[PDB]
Amino acid sequence: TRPAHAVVLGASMAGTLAAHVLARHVDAVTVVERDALPEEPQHRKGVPQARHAHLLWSNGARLIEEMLPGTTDRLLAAGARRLGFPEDLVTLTGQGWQHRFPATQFALVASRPLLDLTVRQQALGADNITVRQRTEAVELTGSGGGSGGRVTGVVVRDLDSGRQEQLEADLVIDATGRGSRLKQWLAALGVPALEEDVVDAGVAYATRLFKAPPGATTHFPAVNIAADDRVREPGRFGVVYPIEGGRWLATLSCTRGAQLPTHEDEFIPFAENLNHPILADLLRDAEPLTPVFGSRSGANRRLYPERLEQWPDGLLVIGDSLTAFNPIYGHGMSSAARCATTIDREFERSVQARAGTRALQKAIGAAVDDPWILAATKDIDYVNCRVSATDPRLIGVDTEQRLRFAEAITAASIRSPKASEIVTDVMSLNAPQAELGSNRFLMAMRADERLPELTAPPFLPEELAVVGLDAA
Amino acid sequence: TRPAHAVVLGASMAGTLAAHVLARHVDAVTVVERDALPEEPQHRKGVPQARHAHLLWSNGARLIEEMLPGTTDRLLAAGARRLGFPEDLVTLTGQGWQHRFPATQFALVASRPLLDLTVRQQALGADNITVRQRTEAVELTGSGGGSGGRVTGVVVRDLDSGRQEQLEADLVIDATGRGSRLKQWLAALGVPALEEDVVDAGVAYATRLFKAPPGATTHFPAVNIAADDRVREPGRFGVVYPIEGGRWLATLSCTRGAQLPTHEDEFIPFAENLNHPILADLLRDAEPLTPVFGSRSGANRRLYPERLEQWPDGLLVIGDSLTAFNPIYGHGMSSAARCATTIDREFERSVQARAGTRALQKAIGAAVDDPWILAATKDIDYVNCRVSATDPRLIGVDTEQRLRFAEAITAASIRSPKASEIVTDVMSLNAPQAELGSNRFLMAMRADERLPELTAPPFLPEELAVVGLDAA
Ligand SMILES: Cc1cc2nc3c(=O)[nH]c(=O)nc-3n(C[C@H](O)[C@H](O)[C@H](O)COP(=O)(O)OP(=O)(O)OC[C@H]3O[C@@H](n4cnc5c(N)ncnc54)[C@H](O)[C@@H]3O)c2cc1C
Ligand SMILES: Cc1cc2nc3c(=O)[nH]c(=O)nc-3n(C[C@H](O)[C@H](O)[C@H](O)COP(=O)(O)OP(=O)(O)OC[C@H]3O[C@@H](n4cnc5c(N)ncnc54)[C@H](O)[C@@H]3O)c2cc1C
Numbered sequence: 009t010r011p012a013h014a015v016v017l018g019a020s021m022a023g024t025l026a027a028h029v030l031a032r033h034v035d036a037v038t039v040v041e042r043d044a045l046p047e048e049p050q051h052r053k054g055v056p057q058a059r060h061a062h063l064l065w066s067n068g069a070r071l072i073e074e075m076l077p078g079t080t081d082r083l084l085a086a087g088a089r090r091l092g093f094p095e096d097l098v099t100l101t102g103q104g105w106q107h108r109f110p111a112t113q114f115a116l117v118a119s120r121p122l123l124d125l126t127v128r129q130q131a132l133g134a135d136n137i138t139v140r141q142r143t144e145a146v147e148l149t150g151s152g153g154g155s156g157g158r159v160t161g162v163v164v165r166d167l168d169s170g171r172q173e174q175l176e177a178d179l180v181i182d183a184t185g186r187g188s189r190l191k192q193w194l195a196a197l198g199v200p201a202l203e204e205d206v207v208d209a210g211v212a213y214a215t216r217l218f219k220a221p222p223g224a225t226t227h228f229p230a231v232n233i234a235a236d237d238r239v240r241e242p243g244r245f246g247v248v249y250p251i252e253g254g255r256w257l258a259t260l261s262c263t264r265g266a267q268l269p270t271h272e273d274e275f276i277p278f279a280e281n282l283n284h285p286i287l288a289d290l291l292r293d294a295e296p297l298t299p300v301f302g303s304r305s306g307a308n309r310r311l312y313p314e315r316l317e318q319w320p321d322g323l324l325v326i327g328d329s330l331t332a333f334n335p336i337y338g339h340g341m342s343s344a345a346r347c348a349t350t351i352d353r354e355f356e357r358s359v360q361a362r363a364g365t366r367a368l369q370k371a372i373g374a375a376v377d378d379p380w381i382l383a384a385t386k387d388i389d390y391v392n393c394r395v396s397a398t399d400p401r402l403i404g405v406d407t408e409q410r411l412r413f414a415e416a417i418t419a420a421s422i423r424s425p426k427a428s429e430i431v432t433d434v435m436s437l438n439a440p441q442a443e444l445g446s447n448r449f450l451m452a453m454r455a456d457e458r459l460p461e462l463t464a465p466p467f468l469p470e471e472l473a474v475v476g477l478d479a480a
Numbered sequence: 481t482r483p484a485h486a487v488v489l490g491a492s493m494a495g496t497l498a499a500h501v502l503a504r505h506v507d508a509v510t511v512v513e514r515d516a517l518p519e520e521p522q523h524r525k526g527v528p529q530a531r532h533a534h535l536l537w538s539n540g541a542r543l544i545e546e547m548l549p550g551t552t553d554r555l556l557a558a559g560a561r562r563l564g565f566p567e568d569l570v571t572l573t574g575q576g577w578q579h580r581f582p583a584t585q586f587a588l589v590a591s592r593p594l595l596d597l598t599v600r601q602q603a604l605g606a607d608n609i610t611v612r613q614r615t616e617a618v619e620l621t622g623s624g625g626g627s628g629g630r631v632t633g634v635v636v637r638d639l640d641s642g643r644q645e646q647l648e649a650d651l652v653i654d655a656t657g658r659g660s661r662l663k664q665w666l667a668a669l670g671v672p673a674l675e676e677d678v679v680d681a682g683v684a685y686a687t688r689l690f691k692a693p694p695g696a697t698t699h700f701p702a703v704n705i706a707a708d709d710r711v712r713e714p715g716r717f718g719v720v721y722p723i724e725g726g727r728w729l730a731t732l733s734c735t736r737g738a739q740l741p742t743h744e745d746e747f748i749p750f751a752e753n754l755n756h757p758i759l760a761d762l763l764r765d766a767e768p769l770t771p772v773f774g775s776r777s778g779a780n781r782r783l784y785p786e787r788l789e790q791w792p793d794g795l796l797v798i799g800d801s802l803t804a805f806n807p808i809y810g811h812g813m814s815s816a817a818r819c820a821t822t823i824d825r826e827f828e829r830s831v832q833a834r835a836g837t838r839a840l841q842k843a844i845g846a847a848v849d850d851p852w853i854l855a856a857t858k859d860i861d862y863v864n865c866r867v868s869a870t871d872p873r874l875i876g877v878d879t880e881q882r883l884r885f886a887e888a889i890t891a892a893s894i895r896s897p898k899a900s901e902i903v904t905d906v907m908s909l910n911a912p913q914a915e916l917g918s919n920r921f922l923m924a925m926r927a928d929e930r931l932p933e934l935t936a937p938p939f940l941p942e943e944l945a946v947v948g949l950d951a952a
């Protein structure tokens with residue numbers, strides 16, 4: 009028989025999308041969220057990464073727009089910018105500057121709390137969605153111990169007065185995030201441990217927001233300094249994106265072995281000593297609007313509940329709980345949208361005992377494969393990267409065959425339009441990484457023209473006039 | 481390493497589409513076809529079903545259009561018709577006449593040889609495709625059984641010289657259709673037998689081609705008398721479709737226990753003994769252009785190579801060879817297009833592991849589930865139906881509840897616009913059969929208005945004037 013009540017743990021991107029989707033297929037859905045959610049855009053305790061740069065790649069954006077029509081126009085009215093790639097960015101790769109070919113993909117950029125609010129408003133207004141704020145999931149209950157267990161509900165605790173309630177339900181959705189209490193709950197029911205691939209390059213972040221020169225958030229590009237160097241030196245990177253309200257969101261990052269700015273005054277010097285100091289030039293006369301924010305949530309991890317024979321019935325794991333990625337590639341929100349979309353597309357087909365929630369988690373795991381293999385492939389080669397994985401695409405691979413080809417892909421994408429186009433398809437999560445090994449790509453990479461190398465960041469003169477730096 | 485040479489066995493719809501797709505991912509593609517392929521739209525021995533009415537549902541038409549842009553316009557310029565459902569059809573169901581709501585789906589209708597030629601012209605002109613006509617696939621080469629069987633190529637025989645030749649290949653695609661000798665080729669290699677579901681209502685067809693009254697193929701709807709009483713009485717059905725050249729293709733059908741016309745003078749009386757005699761009224765004075773053609777290719781059957789642990793590497797099976805349906809629901813060509821589209825989307829991901837073909841075949845198997853479960857569900861309850869299936873959606877099911885739910889779906893779709901729209905999504909193969917059990921459908925089915933029962937076929941006066949009738 010069908011699930012009549014579903015409870016989703018978490019009201020971040022994964023849980024909000026899953027709640028809306030499950031509300032179409034289940035009579036009642038209740039969402040459990042620890043924080044209070046404001047109806048004006050504010051940062052909150054449960055989303056600590058919201059202080060850092062968040063790009064909603066076109067894959068996630070289109071999937072959210074299809075589930076929740078009007079969300080993008082709504083975002084555009086609230087001041088978000090639709091950055092076209094590679095056209096609206098000044099990007100330095102390890103092979104040189106990206107030619108700003110006419111945009112072949114896009115990403116929506118705005119403050120993460122604004123996007124979360126916009127999605128929550130579109131998604132949680134259904135009458136069969138009850139949102140229980142200030143409520144925490146303690147552990148889950150079920151008929152475990154193996155032989156083919158089932159999850160029956162979740163222990164919740166109200167946070168304004170610590171009274172508890174055993175939340176009983178036909179299906180439980182773990183969207184608690186990267187720090188989620190899933191593997192301890194799995195232990196508490198006696199189901200054996202999951203298989204887990206890890207590629208951890210130890211990426212850490214440091215973000216500050218500035219007030220952009222008037223008109224810069226519309227008439228000036230974003231700037232991204234990314235030194236590809238993996239196997240000789242820890243990476244150090246920095247990016248500045250425009251957001252709503254005429255403000256620049258500046259995020260610095262590095263890999264294990266390099267050290268981040270932690271004081272305000274050492275921030276710009278990190279931007280100063282990148283391979284080009286363009287970020288420091290932009291940030292010297294901007295109004296700082298925030299302190300430094302830090303994050304060390306930089307590992308690629310992936311659990312494979314689809315591989316375990318004793319995966320309990322009635323339980324699903326989505327979002328950062330299922331698999332989390334190096335944020336440098338910006339796929340977590342698109343991977344979350346894929347999980348909900350997969351649920352929407354396969355729900356009725358697989359609930360037709362629940363021998364079908366195996367198929368759901370199998371479908372979900374297949375939906376998150378693209379952002380996993382993308383991030384892990386690029387991170388596996390960093391010095392000081394810590395790896396514990398079974399993926400034959402990573403481990404059964406000549407490391408110098410991957411490096412030489414990684415460099416060649418990059419060199420093509422910065423100066424060949426047709427290779428740039430396919431590479432942005434992969435980077436936007438609209439084509440699998442394997443497409444970069446396809447006959448089609450290898451043909452473009454060889455047949456397409458290659459423009460001369462850019463000897464300076466490809467700013468247009470009028471763009472430097474908006475931020476007042478023409479001598480560059 | 482990656483496949484460099486692929487051999488496609490059969491050049492009907494499944495093999496032509498698969499060859500076109502494979503030529504984009506593999507250096508060389510050879511197509512082996514027993515028949516000579518005409519450069520004019522002509523019938524041929526290898527596709528005898530082409531004598532009968534063929535509908536290309538929007539699912540297949542859109543997938544073909546995306547693989548081969550311009551195919552639809554080229555079909556329409558050659559005289560194909562775009563039939564909107566339900567608007568452009570006068571249909572009698574077991575619950576009454578379908579209200580001709582504004583079209584929510586469509587199908588392209590033309591003679592199958594015209595559709596085949598147009599597709600082959602768009603698809604087989606790639607320069608890395610070699611088509612070996614008048615050539616027969618005799619057997620496969622390789623080792624089978626054990627921990628790792630593989631197909632290495634194909635023994636072919638030229639039919640004009642009689643000479644044989646071992647065609648080596650990295651990948652072999654069986655697209656030889658319902659009469660495919662794949663199970664003997666697997667036995668000859670030592671592969672254990674496949675699991676196979678069958679739901680066989682003994683469907684048969686009898687078709688004649690007629691000259692339509694002038695203008696009827698553009699200004700007169702198709703007509704479909706499709707009223708059953710499955711569990712008490714064999715089905716008897718009839719359809720008249722317009723095709724190119726001002727012609728009507730009339731296909732009568734019945735299930736096991738009823739008798740089809742075999743002689744020309746028995747054709748109109750079968751149409752007369754349908755629940756409404758409109759088909760006989762339309763055809764009585766129409767000029768017949770052919771004798772009666774018959775077909776007994778009416779079983780639903782599905783092989784599950786994706787379930788076989790000893791499925792050999794380098795082998796894929798698609799099209800009617802993998803799974804074939806009762807043609808009354810008209811999904812075989814859309815299922816073929818789904819197999820080719822799946823190969824296009826999953827190929828690169830699945831070669832970068834053994835030969836990658838187990839993952840492809842599994843993806844192919846999931847893509848053919850929609851037409852299988854639809855056709856099998858509708859046929860399973862016919863009197864004298866032969867059922868040999870392990871599908872739990874079919875076998876573990878209260879049959880009076882299934883008949884009771886089928887009747888209710890039909891009664892809703894004929895008289896409620898919102899129920900019609902969802903049913904046409906399912907019937908056009910654009911939403912799974914399971915959607916008819918969703919909360920969305922059950923609520924649409926109850927909340928929507930229901931128009932009055934039609935007491936006569938919903939022809940317009942102008943349409944009855946085109947064919948010279950005053951009242952059905
Ligand atoms: C530095 C950084 C930068 C990133 N940049 C990008 C980017 O540019 N683009 C992009 O697409 N993604 C980006 N990501 C990833 C993205 O932020 C996440 O993948 C996304 O938020 C999806 O996570 P989630 O919703 O599954 O979980 P989370 O966002 O981590 O949310 C978990 C939610 O569950 C709640 N919760 C947790 N435990 C409990 C409990 N026990 N009881 C009740 N409630 C609970 C929390 O309060 C919270 O609301 C970035 C991540 C980081 C760390
Ligand atoms: C009566 C009837 C009506 C139908 N109506 C519809 C409809 O309305 N809509 C729809 O979508 N589908 C319809 N179908 C189904 C549709 O005809 C098939 O699904 C479609 O042709 C795809 O089949 P295929 O390419 O896999 O195989 P086939 O069309 O059967 O082609 C097999 C090909 O392989 C070749 N071949 C066979 N053996 C060998 C060998 N040993 N070596 C080399 N070549 C070989 C044959 O010559 C042929 O070219 C109908 C089918 C029937 C029987």
Ligand SMILES: CC(=O)OC/C=C(\C)CC/C=C(\C)CC[C@H]1OC1(C)C
Nearest residue numbers: 532533534704706719731807808810
């Ligand atoms: C309601 C019900 O009974 O199921 C749905 C099927 C119907 C109504 C048959 C319409 C005929 C169709 C599409 C023709 C298919 C093609 O094979 C021929 C040659 C006839």
Ligand SMILES: [Cl-]
Nearest residue numbers: 528529775777
């Ligand atoms: Cl036939």
